Ligand binder design. Sequence first.
Ligand SMILES: [Cl-]
Ligand code: NA
Ligand code: NA
Length: 129
Amino acid sequence: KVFGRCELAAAMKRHGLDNYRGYSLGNWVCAAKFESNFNTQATNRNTDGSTDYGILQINSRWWCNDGRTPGSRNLCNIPCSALLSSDITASVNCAKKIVSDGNGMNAWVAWRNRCKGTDVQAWIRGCRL
Ligand SMILES: [Cl-]
Ligand code: NA
Ligand code: NA
C-alpha cells in the first residue's frame, strides 16, 4: 500500500506514535517519506547482507527474521514479511522498541540526514487529525 501523507499521519496517531518518546508526529511522517516514500512494500538490501523492510525500513540484522541474515537478532520477534503489510501495526510496534533503545530516532539514517533539525510539523500541515 502507498499511503497518502495525511492518511499515514492519521494511522500513526491512532497507533500512538504522536509524541512517542518525545518525537512529534511530523518526525515519524518525515522518516516514512524518506525511508520508503510511504510504500509499505519497500525493501532494500544492505552491504552486510541484511535487508530493510516496510514503511520504516526496519533492518533484519537486529529487528526481524527474514531467514537469510545469519546471526541476526529478531528483537521484534516477527518475520520481516509482516512489516510489509498494508496494516502498519507490526511496523509501528517494532518502531516503538527501536526508538526506545537509547539512540532515539537517530537509528533511522534518513531521519537523521533529512528530518532532524527541520520544520517537521510541515509534514502534518493541512491534515484533519
Ligand atoms: Cl540519508
Ligand atoms: Na520491495
Ligand atoms: Na536479508
